[PDB]
Write a protein that binds this ligand. Sequence first.
Ligand SMILES: Nc1ncnc2c1ncn2[C@@H]1O[C@H](COP(=O)(O)OP(=O)(O)OP(=O)(O)O)[C@@H](O)[C@H]1O
Ligand SMILES: [Mg+2]
Lengths: 209, 232, 228, 199, 238, 250, 239
Amino acid sequence: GVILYGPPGTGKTLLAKAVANQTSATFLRVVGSELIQKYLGDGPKLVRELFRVAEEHAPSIVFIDEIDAIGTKRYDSNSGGEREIQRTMLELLNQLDGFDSRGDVKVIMATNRIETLDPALIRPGRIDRKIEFPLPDEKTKKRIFQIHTSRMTLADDVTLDDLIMAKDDLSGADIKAICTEAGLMALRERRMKVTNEDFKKSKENVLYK
Amino acid sequence: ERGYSFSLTTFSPSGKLVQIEYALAAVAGGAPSVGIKAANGVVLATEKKQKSILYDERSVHKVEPITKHIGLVYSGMGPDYRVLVHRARKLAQQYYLVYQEPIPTAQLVQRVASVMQEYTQSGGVRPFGVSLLICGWNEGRPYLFQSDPSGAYFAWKATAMGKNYVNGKTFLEKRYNEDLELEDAIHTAILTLKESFEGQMTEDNIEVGICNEAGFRRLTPTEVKDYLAAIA
Amino acid sequence: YDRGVNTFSPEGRLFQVEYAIEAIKLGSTAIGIQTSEGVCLAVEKRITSPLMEPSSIEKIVEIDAHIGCAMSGLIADAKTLIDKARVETQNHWFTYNETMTVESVTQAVSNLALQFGEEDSRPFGVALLFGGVDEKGPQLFHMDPSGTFVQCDARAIGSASEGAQSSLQEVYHKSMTLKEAIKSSLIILKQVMEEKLNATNIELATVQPGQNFHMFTKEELEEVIKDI
Amino acid sequence: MEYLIGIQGPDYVLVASDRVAASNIVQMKDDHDKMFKMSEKILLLCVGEAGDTVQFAEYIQKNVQLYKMRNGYELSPTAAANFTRRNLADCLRSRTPYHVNLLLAGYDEHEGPALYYMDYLAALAKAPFAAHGYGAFLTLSILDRYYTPTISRERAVELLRKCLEELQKRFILNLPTFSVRIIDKNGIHDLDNISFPKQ
Amino acid sequence: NQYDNDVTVWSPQGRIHQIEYAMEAVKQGSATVGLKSKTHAVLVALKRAQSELAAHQKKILHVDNHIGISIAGLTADARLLCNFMRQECLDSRFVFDRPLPVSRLVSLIGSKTQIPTQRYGRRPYGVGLLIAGYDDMGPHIFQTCPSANYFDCRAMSIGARSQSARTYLERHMSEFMECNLNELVKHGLRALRETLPAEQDLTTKNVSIGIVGKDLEFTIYDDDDVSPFLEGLEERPQ
Amino acid sequence: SRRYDSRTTIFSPEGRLYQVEYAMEAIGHAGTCLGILANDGVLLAAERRNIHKLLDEVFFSEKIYKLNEDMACSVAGITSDANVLTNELRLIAQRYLLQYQEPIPCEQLVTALCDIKQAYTQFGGKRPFGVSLLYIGWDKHYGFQLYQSDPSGNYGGWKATCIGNNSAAAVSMLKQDYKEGEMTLKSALALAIKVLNKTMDVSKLSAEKVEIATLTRENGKTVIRVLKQKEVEQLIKKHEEEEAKAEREK
Amino acid sequence: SYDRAITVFSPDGHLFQVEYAQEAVKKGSTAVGVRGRDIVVLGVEKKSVAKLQDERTVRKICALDDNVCMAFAGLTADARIVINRARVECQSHRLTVEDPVTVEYITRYIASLKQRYTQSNGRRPFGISALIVGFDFDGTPRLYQTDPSGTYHAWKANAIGRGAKSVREFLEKNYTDEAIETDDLTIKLVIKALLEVVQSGGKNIELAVMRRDQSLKILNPEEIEKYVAEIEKEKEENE
Ligand SMILES: Nc1ncnc2c1ncn2[C@@H]1O[C@H](COP(=O)(O)OP(=O)(O)OP(=O)(O)O)[C@@H](O)[C@H]1O
Ligand SMILES: [Mg+2]
């Protein structure tokens, strides 16, 4: 098992797309919020038939994203309260390390609140590798601007190094959030190249609100 | 015995002190009361309905004097009020034994609100469930202050506390100006307490106290009947 | 969910006394051997880094001129018990003009070991050996986080405690000499530690009836190693 | 009982004391030192009974050294002297009042040189010259006879030479030797340990 | 079980579980047997050890010249009540210049140990005191328990596997009030061979005997002077 | 009794502690204060919050508190917790003056209060203060100074800092328009009205919505002047005249 | 009075409030120190300056006496009260035994203050680690460090803070005998050390040396601008 954790917007969901680009396995994805159901016992039924689908196809990769959301947010659709969340997690606790013949199924999980969920689910045997994602370092930040501004006709007015230390802990998601927005200001004026004052009003729009 | 020595009032993860927010809910479910200062004195008027005809209305009082020239009303729960009255009665004396002077109304609210803030941080206590209105005429000019269970205070021209206080503040905003006498402010304090009372507003359903430069005093039900007459 | 610090188990022992017994299984191992010629007493250091200065740490420390000590488990709270023992041996000298016996040092410490609570806050997580020569000859005692002490003849405490005790019951007899008891201990420490044995990973100290508490240093120590 | 002196000039403070540590009728030590540093430009000169001169004056010394480490700069001579006055006055109405007589000398880069005067009742006095002991009765009259506010430090030493030769003419105690300091913008400087040969 | 956490909390059945768990602590220590004649009070203990080279943990202690005790449980709380026990004996000897009577000593212990069984965050004392002594009324055998309930008795036995020792004492206690010091002791020594596995019994280094006597100060016998008492016992029948 | 204890002192398993971070979460909302200096003089620009039409507008100030005879403070956060701190370091400066007969240096007044504030975060089982506050003042050792306190207990010297609701937007613009040692006490005032033009979402800059107090050094006075409501609006429109000039000509 | 046991044992033998406080140290800014045979050199990195603050109120290297310097990591509010309690003790040593404080003595005071504070009632432990550096009497330069559990411990070269394992691995492959040859050559080891850390390319680093008879003497960002030139110049020609 492999789990991925860290602050929001650092590239947890971004890395899983690179795996599904590369692999020749069948790739199944489910979000952790849609594991909870409005009827009693419809939750653990949904898990049992997920791993049935995953096993009956191929060597396969099961990706479960945002699994802290099964325990944080309480919804009034769920007739069973917290003790229906619990019975679903007992079924999920089975399907990773039950006694049944498992087969060739790899499990990838991702969250940003790693301290909330059950430690019995993160024991070795169910998840072996525990990968932390840090905030982007300020020389890795410059690499990210080189990526998201690759295929744009960037005017030579701008200096990216002023943009880097603007927020001291801007994530990799913020960089794409600025670079997509500054392109939207140029189309208001029908221009083709992005100038410096585009970026000057971009971080006011994106960060500061 | 002993105490608990830990604060049972903590910060929420959204950054709000929840027990103080709940104490303001108990203040809003109290009896309505308004207070108006106008250019020569302050009018404090409240709303006191006994639950049945068996009660002796001349036994307890909402409007209380603190000294020769400071009165004080509330809108909250009953037994918490009598505690910080007896506290504020004492605080006006230790100012007087040092300085040989009646206490300014501002400096009383400096020290009454310091009690309420101290009481919402210390160990093992729930905060007060009352808000106050304090009047007084020190050095000619009158004063009208309002505290809260959190420990803050304000300087109002006219305000309302209790049930339907958001309707009284709209009513006072369309009524009050800078230039009124004391007997005009009495007439508009009854006119704003009639917004939320029952059908019969008699001489004993309300309780009015005034300040002058002659000092704080509390109205008897004789002239309260005369003010209640020819009203609205 | 959260008990207090002062709660009995359904099996009746305690919670945090029994948890502190587990904590001394993480400390470095230590061996003491009582011999009628004298008490030898050794330890490893568990050197972590090459940049580390090796002699700044210690496990053998003296209480008085005729009593040595050896600590295991945690170290930072062992220094509290050492200071209470040094003061106690000097109050006994001040009021009685003699040397406090080795046993009576131990119960002066063991009364302190179980005194936590919520008035006047956790048990100490160390384990100690007391080697000394009083008027009844050489002595060797061993206390507990529970405050239970008993005289031992060859006690091995640390992470390799139960592995060493089995190999120590076979070689000990009541008529040893001190020259062979020192050699017999470093054979045991050569097995149980991680790194190789040299003049810096370990240190020894012996107390004699004739002379006082003597701690070996890195010059007279390696003649035992090269002649192992 | 024993003597020290406080001549203060335009940009210097000239202080001196004796060196005799006394006893019943004998003198135990002939080269005692009544001089206590606290900073690079503040001295302290303490006179009194046996235990209090030593322990009070080093109690102040550890509070002035602490102020420099907590802040990075030193006390002024005005503030350092006025911190001492609070400590006698608070400990005056106590079970153990200190019985010391002292005068403090200091230089500052803002108000220049300064001299303060105290007693065992903690009364401050900003003075141009002062003295303690029974020699103060003999020697203050020479000193205001010849004092100019604009006096140079070379002739201020020989004024002190004149002020001590009279003390070995009409004063019944022995007092052979005298240690001399000088304080200026460059800090404390030791001058010659002036004395009179009894051979 | 939320009723199983603090000494203050009553059970819905009305039985405080923290007191009942301290009874489990005295059942962990090794057995010891006390009994009395008309003129003597003898208590016999059985030591244990950890390895074969470590020494055996002693259990019989000397409180005064006419009072001795025997412990069972954790040894640290035993010394806590022992230093209270010695202190209450010599100050009565300091004030009144007399030996403090035994039945009046134990009621001081019962008021001492009842206090932490009622406060908040205070454990009971897990200890197993068997007390033998002299009033002006002859011998006395007293036992205590961590429920602060002391018992007047004539022969008792507490510790691990002690019910087998009590069955031996019931069917022979008609003989106890007549015999001298010699077979009074080996009546009690036949109780300690009852509470053992069937292979090791009494090898002169794990047993101790303490006697107070009508003209005899309280005396502890350890591992050499046991051997005169210990000889003269028959073999275990099988 | 240990079931009701909330343990406001312990660490969290990730290493940080939650209680003061909830307080510094609350210090973001509810208030806006800022300061600036480069030369002779220092100012505190603070924005009023309760702008209801029924108030007396007295006590000479709203969030400005004169502490010493030559220094003052601006506060942010829980106003009731603020009144206890403000009359606590008010007599820290007086017990200094009793002891040394000299006015207190501005830095070691801040360190004295921030040790009292640090102690509640560290033991006692007690609610910490959700109060952060600024410090202006003058002393003979370094001249005009500007400090900032935090509810954790750590302080810092600055040149221009805001603790408003959009304080990150203000700081991002203060380090876009600044000059080290050349901003006189008229350009700083024009810069002050420029910054709270941005961070205040209520536009048009009502002169009764802000408060500005200046500390200038007169020879033995150190005049702390809360400037009145007759000279705010002429400084408001002066910012308004130049912005219509600069926009149209560009 | 608040009487509650904060630090207690785990069911497997840990003190959780201690090792949670060690992670508060593990994200403070990096502090590196080595010792030369005549001049010690320690310097924190990550000043993290925002060019609108007073540069002296952000310092993390202070002095306890004339001979003893001190750097730290963790959270700053707990640091400067341990420092002020150390300033009193090292001053009270001089009212006692006349000599100035040996560098080993002031580490035992800080470590024993920090241990008993993980032992009392109603107190979370401290969340700092320190480096105590001094050249004592008879000119023997040495340094120490202090774990939040309170284990004082000497070293020849060390580093704490965010990114301390990578720097400590860097020093052991780099600490020779001739690295401490010259007083300017030991500084080229520290500037090579923190440049192998979070970036700090001359703009976020502040070295501070001590030549066994001076006080601390911080070099301004002109020699670090000179040293990082020549440390990278030798790297420019060899590779
Ligand atoms: N290190 C990075 N390099 C390049 N792009 C990045 C990086 N981090 C984030 N991004 C950009 O941010 C976008 C969103 O990132 P992503 O959603 O994977 O972060 P996340 O941590 O999974 O978010 P969440 O925590 O909300 O699930 C991606 O489309 C990617 O383009
Ligand atoms: Mg994502």
